[PDB]
Enzyme design. Structure first.
Site, PDB file in Angstrom:
ATOM      1  N   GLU A 171      36.777  38.396  41.438  1.00  0.00           N
ATOM      2  CA  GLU A 171      35.436  38.172  41.285  1.00  0.00           C
ATOM      3  C   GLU A 171      34.638  38.303  42.614  1.00  0.00           C
ATOM      4  O   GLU A 171      33.445  38.979  42.803  1.00  0.00           O
ATOM      5  CB  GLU A 171      35.207  37.062  40.514  1.00  0.00           C
ATOM      6  CG  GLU A 171      35.622  37.152  38.966  1.00  0.00           C
ATOM      7  CD  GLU A 171      34.699  38.298  38.132  1.00  0.00           C
ATOM      8  OE1 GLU A 171      33.692  38.512  38.508  1.00  0.00           O
ATOM      9  OE2 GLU A 171      35.596  38.652  37.169  1.00  0.00           O
ATOM     10  N   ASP A 196      25.625  37.659  38.497  1.00  0.00           N
ATOM     11  CA  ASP A 196      26.576  36.810  38.464  1.00  0.00           C
ATOM     12  C   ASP A 196      26.759  35.962  39.745  1.00  0.00           C
ATOM     13  O   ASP A 196      26.592  36.536  40.645  1.00  0.00           O
ATOM     14  CB  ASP A 196      28.076  37.320  38.165  1.00  0.00           C
ATOM     15  CG  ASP A 196      27.850  38.325  36.932  1.00  0.00           C
ATOM     16  OD1 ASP A 196      27.546  37.791  36.035  1.00  0.00           O
ATOM     17  OD2 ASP A 196      28.374  39.660  37.276  1.00  0.00           O
TER      18      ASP A 196
END
Length: 122
Positions: A32, A50
């Protein structure tokens, strides 16, 4: 700044994450954010972004400071997810996992199988 697999595993363990989950958590962080705490992802197809080491979404989990609607299920500003201290991100990530499972992360597909033992981190 940037964690390593073992520093992240150690800190997450200290914050109460069981060892049996750590390879998965670190695999997810690696994909991520490359373990970076301060990263805001590229804008998604739905206009969301995000946040942080676990790339936690600002439509569902954290409240954008701009006041745009979010479910803010983790009950924090998205900026809280960018801090050097990962506790907020960890607590939020655990919530996401509790509610939605590992598959909440698109990168879970890379982390769902054999993974190295975390024991060398301890």
């Amino acid at each position: 700044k940037t964690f390593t697999r073992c520093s992240l595993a150690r800190e997450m363990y200290a914050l109460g994450v069981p060892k049996s989950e750590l390879p998965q958590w670190t695999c997810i962080a690696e994909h991520e954010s490359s373990y970076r705490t301060n990263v805001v992802g590229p804008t998604n197809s739905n206009g969301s972004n995000d946040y942080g080491i676990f790339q936690i979404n600002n439509y569902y989990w954290c409240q954008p400071s701009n006041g745009r609607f979010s479910y803010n299920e983790c009950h924090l500003s998205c900026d809280a997810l960018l801090t050097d201290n990962i506790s907020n991100s960890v607590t939020c990530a655990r919530k996401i996992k509790s509610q939605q499972g590992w598959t909440a992360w698109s990168t879970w597909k890379y982390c769902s199988g054999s993974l190295p033992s975390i024991n060398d981190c301890f």
